Ligand binder design. Structure first.
Ligand SMILES: C[S@@+](CC[C@H](N)C(=O)[O-])C[C@H]1O[C@@H](n2cnc3c(N)ncnc32)[C@H](O)[C@@H]1O
Ligand SMILES: C[S@@+](CC[C@H](N)C(=O)[O-])C[C@H]1O[C@@H](n2cnc3c(N)ncnc32)[C@H](O)[C@@H]1O
Lengths: 229, 229
């Protein structure tokens, strides 16, 4: 079943707009063909009603039960100097079930906050596309940027991924925790001074084996481990 | 320090040739600056001996401590219909430590064998670049394409990643195995017909939580779990 996204409800009809109208057209949906539509935290099985140029209305047939991630993870991602890489990180974090995404400004990360705020518009659209593809009805919230220097661990388990520090193995982490905070560096990584402060604050430094990975690969590695164990 | 790749040694000198010389010059190495050079399974610390027009000789001054992957993994990757995606999978599999990469032709995968063979040339270049960036001294072999119907469970643990089958959790597979065979599907996944055959042949079906991932995301997810546990 194809899945679409809506942020507009009119009675018992879910409305598709702009990009979703185009996506709907591409799928060449049949008159009585059922499809899913994500709206306000749930996936609704629907059938088509109106097919117009700037709008597709979908009749709600059945409201499905929403499956939530087994763990509540907040990813504090140092913005990559190559902004394009964030498209992948945001997409994959969404697929994996991460609940909250916080862009971080660190010593070696992208530095322009204004550009980060603008790019966030695109990142939110990427989250929506990933939600449709992964059949994830709950959004991944993208928050305003925070500076690494101001972070304070507050989750049940708090981790800093660092290839430059002889940290602990993933299995040494509290895998029974239900809430996590994970801090990941940009291409250049974390400076020794930056990471030291984070470790002193209470972030457990984790080292993935056996090699140093690119930022996006490290994100999926740690999140997949935490989400599945 | 920067790391380079060589397949030619002359006495105590490691030689960089072809495109590697261009790569070296792009890195703008300073006078007396030391750098690493991968050669036959080891990474040597070197300094420039002589720079020529199309080759650079590097004097070995020491040897870096290297580490091999803790697990021997063979990834059987159904070729994605979007061939570009394979560039990412090959690169990440290399970063993660996968030893052997085998492109597979399944019911819903890319079908042109001739095109797969052509792209393999690029995949081999990607492997070398990932080796340099991850400081991985051993290559990842990219084999000729084979059909899903011709796969055999040759490793200590043989797994098929399938979102369409209620398989077991990753933490429940044989994590004490030294060798693994991992089969991953294309964008459209595995048909019920072909997966049933693979399961009967001896492949253990694994289901990642909580949502359906894109192929590349699933690869990093399972490989990271196997390598770190
Ligand atoms: C590419 S790495 C740092 C640069 C890398 N050392 C290099 O020069 O190739 C970017 C980020 O990914 C994460 N990372 C990469 N490899 C890691 C590993 N093996 N263990 C833990 N974190 C890692 C860390 O958050 C790191 O700051
Ligand atoms: C994109 S998935 C299959 C199509 C997907 N269900 C969809 O329609 O969006 C591609 C491949 O990634 C792997 N995969 C993705 N999610 C998975 C999961 N949750 N558990 C196990 N394997 C998964 C499987 O090998 C699958 O064949």
């Amino acid at each position: 079943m194809h899945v679409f996204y809506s942020e507009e409800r009119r009675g018992n009809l879910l409305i598709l707009r702009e990009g979703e109208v185009k996506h709907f057209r591409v799928r060449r949906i049949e008159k009585d063909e059922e499809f899913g539509v994500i709206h306000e935290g749930k996936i609704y099985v629907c059938k088509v009603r109106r097919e117009d140029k700037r709008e597709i209305s979908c009749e709600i047939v059945e409201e499905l039960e929403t499956k939530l991630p087994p763990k509540d993870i907040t990813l504090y991602q140092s913005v990559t100097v190559d902004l394009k890489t964030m498209d992948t990180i945001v997409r994959q974090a969404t697929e994996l079930g991460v609940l909250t995404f916080v862009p971080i400004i660190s010593e070696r990360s992208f530095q322009k906050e204004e550009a980060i705020l603008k790019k966030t518009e695109k990142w939110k659209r990427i989250v929506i596309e990933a939600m449709k593809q992964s059949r994830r009805p709950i959004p991944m919230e993208i928050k305003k940027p925070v500076r690494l220097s101001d972070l304070i661990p507050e989750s049940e388990e708090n981790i800093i991924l660092d290839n430059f520090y002889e940290g602990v193995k993933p299995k040494d982490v509290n895998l029974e925790a239900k809430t996590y905070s994970v801090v990941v560096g940009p291409e250049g990584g974390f400076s020794k001074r930056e990471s030291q402060i984070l470790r002193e604050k209470g972030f457990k430094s984790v080292l993935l084996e056996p090699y140093t990975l690119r930022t996006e690969t490290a994100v999926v590695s740690i999140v997949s481990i935490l989400m599945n164990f």
